[PDB]
């Protein structure tokens, strides 16, 4: 059972708490005597349950839950895939191909090129640029139940900082095993957030609907609207930076409308620490809070679109 | 040229009300915010409040349910209202012009700033004296 | 609760008040003479308005887990008086009570 209560800053009421200053107890080396340790957990961390607001991990109810490693680092990697004897991979080197039909130029490797595991949703990260110009490829266009994977030739440039100064409690709940909890912020309560340069996107998003009209129409009305609802892990771009996972709000990047025919745009990020990517109920991961201010430069080297079926097909 | 000059009554009665007035000369009220200063004897000053047009106008926590501020601007002054006074009140309160800054040390969009308010103009002060 | 600091004259010297910084600080310092009414030194930190010399500095509400000091170079009789603080912190809720001044003591 967590006792929590608002961290420690000035108002206002809107400020909807976020951080929560949870005290509990604690399991020591020896099998007697508890422990009267505080943390400090993300609301989307912690749930209450029904004296004093009293909580719990949201987990929990769930599943099993373990911490990761601080040895080990979710950096992705480049990794070339490659076939065993007898074997061999064929590439595709046109600079126009949709993924499907047959290739011009086509040559074999016995590797692949590094490519790296990077998870993420909504915005493609670190990914391999497109030729000439950008690519549009899906399963089936005239089905909106499939996805349209989108492919840049120009990266659009993005970064995402954890203006945080946390800092990592190391409890012991032995003998051998160690929690990490985060102890009081350092400096200002700040929220985490990811800058696009709106000169960069406005010419990204214009050369991807130019693209978008040779499928629906020369002469059509494209618009870009955010997502319909239901998971933080659909609804909010998920990726990896520095350790922490970030939840970011992109209702600022595909809120336009096309027709026929100098700053940065902040997007609003939330941070978990308990986990379950891929789906996967029965492991959930507690990711350790990360020391210091974090800060990464990526690449948005491509967009996952979805199509409503509200149609009014032949108009937009 | 600013001068300020508060004046009010020097005694006042226990459980009664303070009345006080600080006669603006050098400047309009309504171009200016007004905050009073109290400080006992061998004491650090305590604010009062701080008022301005437009009805913008805050007090002490402390003194919430007690003070009352007002301004002029037909006869170009400041006043002060305290109901249910007490021994606790006797000081020395003075009338300042404030001017507002504004602090950031976030991304301004996300509200990551705070006003603070400092007085850079005050007046000779008035003496207040609570006994029966 | 009262405190004192003695400097000789033509020395350097420091001022302490409020508690340790906790984030970002707008540290608003005031001079109270003897039978007068306290003035404007040194607001935000450490800007100075007109008629205050560059004498006075004082610490930068930058660094975090630090008290407001107020500096001082070039001592003189003059600036024998009581200093207060109002502490502006983003993590503490408005003050309405000026810190606990220190009185600063010009020798010989």
């Known amino acids: 059972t967590l006792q929590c209560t608002n961290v420690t800053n000035n108002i206002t009421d809107d400020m909807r708490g976020e951080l929560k200053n949870c005290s509990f107890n604690m399991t020591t080396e020896l099998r007697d005597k508890k422990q009267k340790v505080y943390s400090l957990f993300y609301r989307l961390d912690v749930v209450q349950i029904n004296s004093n607001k009293e909580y719990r991990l949201i987990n929990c109810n769930t599943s099993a839950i373990t911490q990761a490693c601080p040895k080990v680092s979710f950096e992705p990697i480049p990794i070339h895939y490659c076939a065993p004897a007898g074997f061999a991979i064929l590439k595709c080197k046109d600079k126009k191909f949709n993924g499907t039909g047959p290739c011009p130029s086509v040559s074999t490797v016995q590797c692949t090129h590094g490519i790296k595991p990077v998870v993420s949703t909504q915005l493609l990260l670190n990914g391999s640029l497109a030729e000439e110009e950008v690519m549009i490829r899906s399963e089936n266009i005239t089905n909106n139940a499939k996805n349209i994977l989108v492919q840049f030739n120009t990266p659009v440039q993005i970064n995402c900082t954890r203006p945080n100064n946390n800092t990592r409690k190391s409890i012991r709940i032995g003998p051998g095993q160690a929690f990490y909890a985060t102890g009081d912020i350092i400096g200002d309560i700040r929220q985490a957030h990811c800058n696009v340069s709106k000169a960069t996107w406005n010419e990204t998003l214009g050369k991807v609907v130019k693209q978008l009209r040779k499928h629906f129409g020369n002469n059509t009305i494209i618009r870009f609207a955010n997502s319909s609802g239901g998971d933080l892990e659909v609804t909010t771009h998920s990726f990896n930076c520095g350790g922490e996972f970030f939840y970011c709000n992109t209702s600022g990047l595909f809120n336009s409308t096309w027709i026929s025919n100098n700053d940065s745009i902040t997007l609003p990020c939330r941070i978990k620490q308990i986990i379950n990517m891929w789906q996967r109920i029965g492991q959930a991961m507690y990711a350790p809070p990360i020391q210091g201010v974090i800060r990464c430069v990526s690449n948005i080297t491509g967009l996952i679109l979805t199509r409503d079926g509200g149609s009014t097909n032949s108009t937009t | 040229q600013v001068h300020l000059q508060e004046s009010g009554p020097g005694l006042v009665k226990p459980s009664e009300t303070l009345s006080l007035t600080c006669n603006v000369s050098?400047?309009?009220?309504?171009?200016?915010?007004w905050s009073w200063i109290r400080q006992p004897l061998g004491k650090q000053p305590e604010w009062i409040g701080y008022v301005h047009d437009s009805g913008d106008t805050n007090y002490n926590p402390s003194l919430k349910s007690r003070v009352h501020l007002s301004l002029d601007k037909s006869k170009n002054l400041v006043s002060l209202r305290l109901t249910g006074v007490t021994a606790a009140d006797s000081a020395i309160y003075y009338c300042?012009?404030?001017?507002?800054?504004?602090?950031?040390?976030?991304?301004?969009?996300?509200?990551?700033?705070?006003?603070?308010?400092?007085?850079?103009?005050w007046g000779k002060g008035t003496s207040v004296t609570v006994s029966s | 609760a009262p405190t004192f600091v003695s400097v000789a004259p033509g020395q350097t010297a420091r001022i302490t008040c409020g508690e340790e910084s906790l984030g970002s600080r707008s540290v608003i310092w005031y001079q109270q003479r003897p039978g007068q009414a306290p003035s404007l030194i040194i607001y935000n930190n450490n800007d100075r308005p007109s008629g205050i010399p560059d004498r006075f500095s004082g610490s930068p509400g930058s660094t975090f887990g630090t008290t407001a000091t107020l500096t001082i170079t070039s001592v003189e009789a003059g600036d024998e008086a009581d200093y207060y603080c109002h502490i502006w912190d983003s993590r503490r809720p408005t003050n309405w009570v000026f810190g606990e001044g220190t009185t600063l003591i010009v020798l010989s």
């Open positions: 050098g400047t309009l009220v309504r171009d200016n915010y």
């Open positions: 300042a012009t404030t001017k507002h800054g504004r602090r950031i040390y976030g991304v301004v969009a996300f509200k990551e700033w705070f006003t603070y308010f400092y007085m850079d103009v």
